[PDB]
Amino acid sequence: AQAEIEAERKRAREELRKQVAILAVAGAEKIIERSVDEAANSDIVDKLVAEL
Amino acid sequence: AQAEIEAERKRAREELRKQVAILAVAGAEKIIERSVDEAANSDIVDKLVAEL
Amino acid sequence: EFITVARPYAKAAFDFAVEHQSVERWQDMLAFAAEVTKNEQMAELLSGALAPETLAESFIAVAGEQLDENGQNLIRVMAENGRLNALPDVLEQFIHLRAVSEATAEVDVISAAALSEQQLAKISAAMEKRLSRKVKLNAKIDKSVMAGVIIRAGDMVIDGSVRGRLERLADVL
Amino acid sequence: MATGKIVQVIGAVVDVEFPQDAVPRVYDALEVQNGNERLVLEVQQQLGGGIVRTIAMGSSDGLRRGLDVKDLEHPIEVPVGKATLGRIMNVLGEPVDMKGEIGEEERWAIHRAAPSYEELSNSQELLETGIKVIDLMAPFAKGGKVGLFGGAGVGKTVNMMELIRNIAIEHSGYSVFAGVGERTREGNDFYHEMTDSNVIDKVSLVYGQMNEPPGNRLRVALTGLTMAEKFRDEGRDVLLFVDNIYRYTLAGTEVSALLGRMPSAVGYQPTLAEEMGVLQERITSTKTGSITSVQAVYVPADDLTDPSPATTFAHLDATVVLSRQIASLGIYPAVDPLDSTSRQLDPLVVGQEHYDTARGVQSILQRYQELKDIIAILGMDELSEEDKLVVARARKIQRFLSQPFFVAEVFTGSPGKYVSLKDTIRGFKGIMEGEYDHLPEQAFYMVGSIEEAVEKAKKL
Amino acid sequence: TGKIVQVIGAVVDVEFPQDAVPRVYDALEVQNGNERLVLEVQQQLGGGIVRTIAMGSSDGLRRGLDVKDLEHPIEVPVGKATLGRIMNVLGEPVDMKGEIGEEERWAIHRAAPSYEELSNSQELLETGIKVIDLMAPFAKGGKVGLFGGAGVGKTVNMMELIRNIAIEHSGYSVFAGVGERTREGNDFYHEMTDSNVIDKVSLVYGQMNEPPGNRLRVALTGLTMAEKFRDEGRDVLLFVDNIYRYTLAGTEVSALLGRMPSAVGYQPTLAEEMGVLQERITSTKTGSITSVQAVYVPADDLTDPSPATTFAHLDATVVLSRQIASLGIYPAVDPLDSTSRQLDPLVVGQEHYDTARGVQSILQRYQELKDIIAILGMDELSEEDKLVVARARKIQRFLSQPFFVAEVFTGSPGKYVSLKDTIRGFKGIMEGEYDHLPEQAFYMVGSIEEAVEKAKKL
Amino acid sequence: MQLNSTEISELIKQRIAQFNVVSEAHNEGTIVSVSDGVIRIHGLADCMQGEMISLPGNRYAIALNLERDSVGAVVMGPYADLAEGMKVKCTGRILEVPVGRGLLGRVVNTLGAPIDGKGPLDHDGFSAVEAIAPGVIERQSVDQPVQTGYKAVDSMIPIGRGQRELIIGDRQTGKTALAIDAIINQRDSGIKCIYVAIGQKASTISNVVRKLEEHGALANTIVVVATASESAALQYLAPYAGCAMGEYFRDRGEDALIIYDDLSKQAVAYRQISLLLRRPPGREAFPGDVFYLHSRLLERAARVNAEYVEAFTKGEVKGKTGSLTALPIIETQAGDVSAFVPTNVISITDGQIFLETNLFNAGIRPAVNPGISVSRVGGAAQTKIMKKLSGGIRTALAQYRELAAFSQFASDLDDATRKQLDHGQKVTELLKQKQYAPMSVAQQSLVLFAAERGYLADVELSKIGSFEAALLAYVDRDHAPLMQEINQTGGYNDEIEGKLKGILDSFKATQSW
Amino acid sequence: QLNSTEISELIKQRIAQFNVVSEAHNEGTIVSVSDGVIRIHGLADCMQGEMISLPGNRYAIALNLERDSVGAVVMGPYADLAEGM
Numbered sequence A, B: 001a002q003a004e005i006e007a008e009r010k011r012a013r014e015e016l017r018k019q020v021a022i023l024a025v026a027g028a029e030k031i032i033e034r035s036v037d038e039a040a041n042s043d044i045v046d047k048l049v050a051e052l
Numbered sequence C: 001e002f003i004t005v006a007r008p009y010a011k012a013a014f015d016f017a018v019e020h021q022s023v024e025r026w027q028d029m030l031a032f033a034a035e036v037t038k039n040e041q042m043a044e045l046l047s048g049a050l051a052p053e054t055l056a057e058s059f060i061a062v063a064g065e066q067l068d069e070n071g072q073n074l075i076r077v078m079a080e081n082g083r084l085n086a087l088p089d090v091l092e093q094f095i096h097l098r099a100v101s102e103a104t105a106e107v108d109v110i111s112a113a114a115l116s117e118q119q120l121a122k123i124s125a126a127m128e129k130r131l132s133r134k135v136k137l138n139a140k141i142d143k144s145v146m147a148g149v150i151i152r153a154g155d156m157v158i159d160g161s162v163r164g165r166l167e168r169l170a171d172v173l
Numbered sequence D: 001m002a003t004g005k006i007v008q009v010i011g012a013v014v015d016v017e018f019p020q021d022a023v024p025r026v027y028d029a030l031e032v033q034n035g036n037e038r039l040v041l042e043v044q045q046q047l048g049g050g051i052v053r054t055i056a057m058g059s060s061d062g063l064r065r066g067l068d069v070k071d072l073e074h075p076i077e078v079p080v081g082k083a084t085l086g087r088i089m090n091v092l093g094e095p096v097d098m099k100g101e102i103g104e105e106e107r108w109a110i111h112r113a114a115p116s117y118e119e120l121s122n123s124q125e126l127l128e129t130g131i132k133v134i135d136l137m138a139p140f141a142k143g144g145k146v147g148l149f150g151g152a153g154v155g156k157t158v159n160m161m162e163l164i165r166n167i168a169i170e171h172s173g174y175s176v177f178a179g180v181g182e183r184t185r186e187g188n189d190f191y192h193e194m195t196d197s198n199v200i201d202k203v204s205l206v207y208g209q210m211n212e213p214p215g216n217r218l219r220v221a222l223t224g225l226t227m228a229e230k231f232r233d234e235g236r237d238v239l240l241f242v243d244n245i246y247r248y249t250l251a252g253t254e255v256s257a258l259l260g261r262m263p264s265a266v267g268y269q270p271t272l273a274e275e276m277g278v279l280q281e282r283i284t285s286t287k288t289g290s291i292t293s294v295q296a297v298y299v300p301a302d303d304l305t306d307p308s309p310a311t312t313f314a315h316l317d318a319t320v321v322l323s324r325q326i327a328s329l330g331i332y333p334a335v336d337p338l339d340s341t342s343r344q345l346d347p348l349v350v351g352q353e354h355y356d357t358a359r360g361v362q363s364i365l366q367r368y369q370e371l372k373d374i375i376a377i378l379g380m381d382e383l384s385e386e387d388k389l390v391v392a393r394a395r396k397i398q399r400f401l402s403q404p405f406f407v408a409e410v411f412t413g414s415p416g417k418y419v420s421l422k423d424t425i426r427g428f429k430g431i432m433e434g435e436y437d438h439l440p441e442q443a444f445y446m447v448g449s450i451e452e453a454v455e456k457a458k459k460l
Numbered sequence E: 001t002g003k004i005v006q007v008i009g010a011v012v013d014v015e016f017p018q019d020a021v022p023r024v025y026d027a028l029e030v031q032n033g034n035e036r037l038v039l040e041v042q043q044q045l046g047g048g049i050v051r052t053i054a055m056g057s058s059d060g061l062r063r064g065l066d067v068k069d070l071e072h073p074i075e076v077p078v079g080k081a082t083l084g085r086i087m088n089v090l091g092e093p094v095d096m097k098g099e100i101g102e103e104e105r106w107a108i109h110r111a112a113p114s115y116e117e118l119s120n121s122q123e124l125l126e127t128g129i130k131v132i133d134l135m136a137p138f139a140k141g142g143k144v145g146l147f148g149g150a151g152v153g154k155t156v157n158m159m160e161l162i163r164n165i166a167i168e169h170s171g172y173s174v175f176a177g178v179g180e181r182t183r184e185g186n187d188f189y190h191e192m193t194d195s196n197v198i199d200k201v202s203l204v205y206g207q208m209n210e211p212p213g214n215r216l217r218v219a220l221t222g223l224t225m226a227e228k229f230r231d232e233g234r235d236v237l238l239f240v241d242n243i244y245r246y247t248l249a250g251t252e253v254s255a256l257l258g259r260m261p262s263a264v265g266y267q268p269t270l271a272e273e274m275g276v277l278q279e280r281i282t283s284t285k286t287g288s289i290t291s292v293q294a295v296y297v298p299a300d301d302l303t304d305p306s307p308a309t310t311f312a313h314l315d316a317t318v319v320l321s322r323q324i325a326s327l328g329i330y331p332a333v334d335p336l337d338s339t340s341r342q343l344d345p346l347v348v349g350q351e352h353y354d355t356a357r358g359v360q361s362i363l364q365r366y367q368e369l370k371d372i373i374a375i376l377g378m379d380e381l382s383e384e385d386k387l388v389v390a391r392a393r394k395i396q397r398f399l400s401q402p403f404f405v406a407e408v409f410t411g412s413p414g415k416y417v418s419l420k421d422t423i424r425g426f427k428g429i430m431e432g433e434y435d436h437l438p439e440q441a442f443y444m445v446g447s448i449e450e451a452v453e454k455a456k457k458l
Numbered sequence F: 001m002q003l004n005s006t007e008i009s010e011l012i013k014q015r016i017a018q019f020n021v022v023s024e025a026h027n028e029g030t031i032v033s034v035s036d037g038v039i040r041i042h043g044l045a046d047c048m049q050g051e052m053i054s055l056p057g058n059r060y061a062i063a064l065n066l067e068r069d070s071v072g073a074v075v076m077g078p079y080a081d082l083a084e085g086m087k088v089k090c091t092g093r094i095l096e097v098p099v100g101r102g103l104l105g106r107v108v109n110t111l112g113a114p115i116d117g118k119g120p121l122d123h124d125g126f127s128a129v130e131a132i133a134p135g136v137i138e139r140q141s142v143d144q145p146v147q148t149g150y151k152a153v154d155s156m157i158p159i160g161r162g163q164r165e166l167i168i169g170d171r172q173t174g175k176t177a178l179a180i181d182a183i184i185n186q187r188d189s190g191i192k193c194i195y196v197a198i199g200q201k202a203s204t205i206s207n208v209v210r211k212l213e214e215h216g217a218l219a220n221t222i223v224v225v226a227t228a229s230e231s232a233a234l235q236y237l238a239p240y241a242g243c244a245m246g247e248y249f250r251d252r253g254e255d256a257l258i259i260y261d262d263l264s265k266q267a268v269a270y271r272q273i274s275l276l277l278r279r280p281p282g283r284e285a286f287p288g289d290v291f292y293l294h295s296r297l298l299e300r301a302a303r304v305n306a307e308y309v310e311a312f313t314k315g316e317v318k319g320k321t322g323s324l325t326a327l328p329i330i331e332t333q334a335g336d337v338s339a340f341v342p343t344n345v346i347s348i349t350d351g352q353i354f355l356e357t358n359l360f361n362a363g364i365r366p367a368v369n370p371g372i373s374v375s376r377v378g379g380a381a382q383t384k385i386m387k388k389l390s391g392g393i394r395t396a397l398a399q400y401r402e403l404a405a406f407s408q409f410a411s412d413l414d415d416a417t418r419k420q421l422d423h424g425q426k427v428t429e430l431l432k433q434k435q436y437a438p439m440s441v442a443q444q445s446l447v448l449f450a451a452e453r454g455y456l457a458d459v460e461l462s463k464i465g466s467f468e469a470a471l472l473a474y475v476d477r478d479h480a481p482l483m484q485e486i487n488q489t490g491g492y493n494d495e496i497e498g499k500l501k502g503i504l505d506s507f508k509a510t511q512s513w
Numbered sequence G: 001q002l003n004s005t006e007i008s009e010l011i012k013q014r015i016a017q018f019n020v021v022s023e024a025h026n027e028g029t030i031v032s033v034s035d036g037v038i039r040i041h042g043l044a045d046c047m048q049g050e051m052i053s054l055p056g057n058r059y060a061i062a063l064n065l066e067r068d069s070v071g072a073v074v075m076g077p078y079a080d081l082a083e084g085m
Ligand SMILES: Nc1ncnc2c1ncn2[C@@H]1O[C@H](COP(=O)(O)OP(=O)(O)OP(=O)(O)O)[C@@H](O)[C@H]1O
Pocket: D343, D346, F170, F171, F172, F173, F174, F175, F176, F177, F178, F365, F366, F433, F434, F435
């Protein structure tokens, strides 16, 4: 059983990582869409056209 | 060991609530070059925390 | 679908049009023929087995904007093989071969909203350092992307959008 | 709002043309007004140019070209849950009996992915049917598939009713019965046999018989299987009967031929072993519940090499065969103990005592098989005198394999018995080793447990 | 000047300017990223398109790559310099040694020698294998073929033939491995090199790893080497390790070339593809080629089109069988199905011929009793048909022999049995002079005295 | 313990920090058709054959055809949720798979994605799934032994490192037992193992992995799984994705062992993919190149000489020779060992172990039928002692099993045949062996000594198993150093022959059994 | 949909003059070559079973007189022949 406990620890750690991982980006999307403006838009477009 | 893991889960999750906001802000500020503040988004990060 | 059977006819019609400097007339000719192909009544005729020569004559008659000899001969040749339904694709591949020969390109620019007309200038300038062709943009407005710009040039695209930046991160995790 | 148009009709196959930007995904369901009643089409393939090729879940007579087809955005969905117990439904989940609407609160799609690798149960239990022959010679795994190979007239349906009864009463499970492409007469006089044995309240019936078009006989098994999966999600033990899996294979072949795909090994569809696997793989145990399956199987041309038998047997754990002969001797259930097999018979899984008790009775029976030929040719008096005792123990074993079912009362009068495995092991460990040599062979017949064999001998 | 326009599995389509279209069988060249790929054109479709087979892995080919036209067929090194070296299908050196110093290169597509130039010889080759040179003797400058299903012995028999005839003969030799294991090519390369006979053998390999084009043309490369040595007036040995794989690689590619399937999915040109090869492997008035070809028969079905069309192209045919090998009787030759053009009273003498035919007749009479023996058991037979059965069951064992190359499998030392010493032994058995021995006295022995001796030990 | 939220948070934030935001240009096309798992794509001028195309969702399709105006592809996953008009993006990558010793102990999808719950992989880069095996000059002849647990196969049918050894037989004959026992027996012998399950039931894998973890072997195995429910393409490309992980160790001078659970279900899935593309079938409806399918796969199980390991590894490894050992499993109907796919794979491997249902019904397990089974490398692989004690034992039993045919109703030469029968019968009674009971070469060796120096002429058939069970404990108490020595070396000398004769007299004469 | 030897420059020829001149009718041009069968374009006056004469001293048998082509088999080595002859 010393291995079947370890498998359960690894698996729980993985599921926890998964939830935090999806929350990170799901939140980042809301932060972006809430905090953009045409200066921020211009900076990005003008940076990327300069490597076009 | 199952009961031990199910307690350690809460122990880790509740403090991960304190990191999720750092992750979301770091992700936003990586994808967008214009850094951003907490005040315009506190009520948004708090919902993430509430849903972990 | 006619993508493949339309290639030889497009190439032959373009080659012929170049020798006689009338490419700009041939394109109108083919477009009008592809239009008579889309009519409700003609589309019924074209589908029902009828002898190629009779189908060709009854299709020619419905056009007078066609070069007497060299335009109608294409119709007769396609009728021989039954490929008259292909005209809408012969047109597209004719336009494409022309755009190649004239070294011209067309690129979509997709953005959250309208650009500043200096951004448009720099884009329509740099794309010609990517492509040897002259470029005509056709800006577009798309709110699904929430910042940045998409530049699609044929089947090559450069995804400068923030939406792309997001789903290209969510997958790293 | 309707957006499609029929553009071809050839037999059961219907092609409909949608706008480029709204083509239905595969396995979605459409519907059309086939005159005075709606017809449901299932999408099978996406051709170029917005055209999508479908198969009609009904009769395609009377369909014009140009009819308007409305696109439902979801696969076929059926009513699930407790509300379906005791009802009859067709593929589309419509009540086929005359008892009105199903009051279901929830409806599920019939197309689904199998349980993922880590949902599976981390154990291997046994399903106690309560039948001596089955629980001894061919035990059931909880979550395994079981083949039922007997012919006709031997009692397949009374055995099915017995299992339906026991898994409802002793355990707290429910049963689903899916009739794939079999005679409507059988379905009716099965419904009536179940209704007047009080078991109808504990089983849910979904029939798509031979009369139905190919699509119905194809998808009816998935309808039944999704109702069983709903019961499983409630944490129950379920028993799913498929009344003939070979007809599921053959409906797959018919549809495959309609769609124009190239013939594979013996005319069978190219995708045979996948259409079988994507059914048989949803029938498994799980950390929440389990589905056991009892599947009647027909082997073509008496050939266990034909691709369909060979593809099915890859999935069957157990296998019970019913013999006309065992029934001729008045022994019910007529399970042939020598040809019935399971792959749960290993000391690793069932234990050493059960395993070797079963192997013991098997060797006894198959020796008696040849002594009973020596007898028939030379007469009893030739046999050695230890064999005159083997021929007395084999007869007692062969009797003790009979049982009174609850469902069988209205034939046999005697009340029903449900025998716990341990008791069967006791009884056969006894009979095999001379214990109970002293009491007559008719004290074992139709008794139930062995500690009632003695109390039937008492009064003999 | 060319462009790729399709890539279907192994076959690539290339478009050229209308006036520069390559000829058939010319070799094109493409750069598959950081590499070079050679294509051989098979068909001229219309309008500048030309359809080709890739002599390499097709993965990584984009459409629209530029292809260069080499205006000559595939050409391979040939002659003295190609000796003792391993070569690709394209004639490139595949051992790590230097470049081949060839003076001359030949196209691998050639026409067969005229009927006017052929020659024939009755000069027997005495191999040491009892069964092969009793029942199926073969001659200098003739073709032999070993037919059998998987794992019946047609490679080990070919290696014993190599050992016996190939070293006791002076001229050069060629071994073309078509579509067989690379392990068995490496083990053979080292078996040769560790005995200083490698420098008389030229090796060519298109083993089973390789994509269909290599397996398709490697046999013609080997043939071209053998033909160069023949035209020099020498006499050559040519061993072909599985000729079935040439036709199988033709099948794998046929349908992509747009040709309708035939009898059992085989290409429609099966018999022409097969004849255009087997016709140029022949001796002639200037020099001779002896050859041995292993011929896999699929599913053990000796009536499949592929063995059925090959039977005609051989002088001596040796048919191996699984229902004999499973008895442990190696070499598992079936003596009622082996045969040779050379088995005539005028070629092998009356006594050899008479013994071979008496053996055939006894074994056949034994075949006709196997059903009576099966059903009724053996005790129903006559006193003169129990004796036939016993003599046939002795002849069966005595056809077995230990091989110098099977020592790896059984340790028992290999035996070499001369022809006189076997047409004496079979005469002995058929005339009952050894009836007093047990059957096991004959299993895996050499001459008949080793059996009369092994009987003493029981 | 190890649910440290700091560790998870940094594990994420380091990925965030190194996310290269910079945009990039790619080539793009449209799905035009969808049917039975085949995709027809339109555009993608710069696609290349064998390329991985990335579909919406996160899933891949493999380019099979580059037609003049479209790209034919197959979907490596569930294909229903696709629809005409979806955009697909061409990655630059030919079909690839993760490789590295970090996969050991994981259960992995055929695309490399992990399927147990234990999270993302640790891997040393990627490897191409389709590759051509080492050439004829890079090989080396197989010499080293690979011990299974079984007396029968390790004595009669030896397996060497770099060999390919078909396991063939009818259903429910122990084909999988004989394979996972070989895997288990490498628990401590420095050979990594790989087990790829093609078309098996999901519960059977979930059980095999539990047995592998039970006996402690899982920490040394990769597992690749494509269950019966999964797409034909995933089932078809699985064994190539397993070989791609075995060749990682092969090319570094390490050793690996790979077990294809069914190369018969791979052939069936390829026949499906082939008939859905309208390719003319041949015998038994299998495509033309169903031989090349298995050929290019099994030709990768090889042993390579040290010059090749030097050249491949940029000279970091000297003197070591790597190898990959394959045990493909084939299933045959009704015991017909002579059908198209069974015979095609017999003509590829280097021997076969044939398990017979008639023997397996009669309790003779493992049911190794001698006389039909062979090893084409033969004794070259065996340890010196095993090559001695074994001798031609397998031909002794091959003869015995036809002697029993005619000796059924009578016996003639009826002294020597009597001794021969009573001998071979105790031999077969000795070769049967319980599942999950692997016995080392020392034990197998002195058991074969007991059997072959006549030491079992005395004891009854009934006592055979108890003779072995007591002998193996006697010699474990009283003579441990001799076992410790034979296990360490091939270890055959007349000195040791005398030691064994003495041990087998002493035991025989006083120990109980 | 499949093409049937409608190739760019033949179509262009017909563009310039659909009512093509006689062009003898006793002459055509090889448009395809493969596995010993050649597809000839023209030869309006070919007859079934007629011997068609090729460059060199060779012949073919016209077997598949068809609407566009005359499909003929070469009586000898064919690999020499080339489109446009
Ligand atoms: N050495 C042995 N002794 C006793 N029983 C054995 C032995 N090896 C295998 N078995 C039994 O054989 C049965 C089937 O074995 P296994 O599953 O390996 O065969 P299989 O051919 O893989 O089956 P399938 O073909 O269904 O995969 C197992 O239940 C096992 O108990």
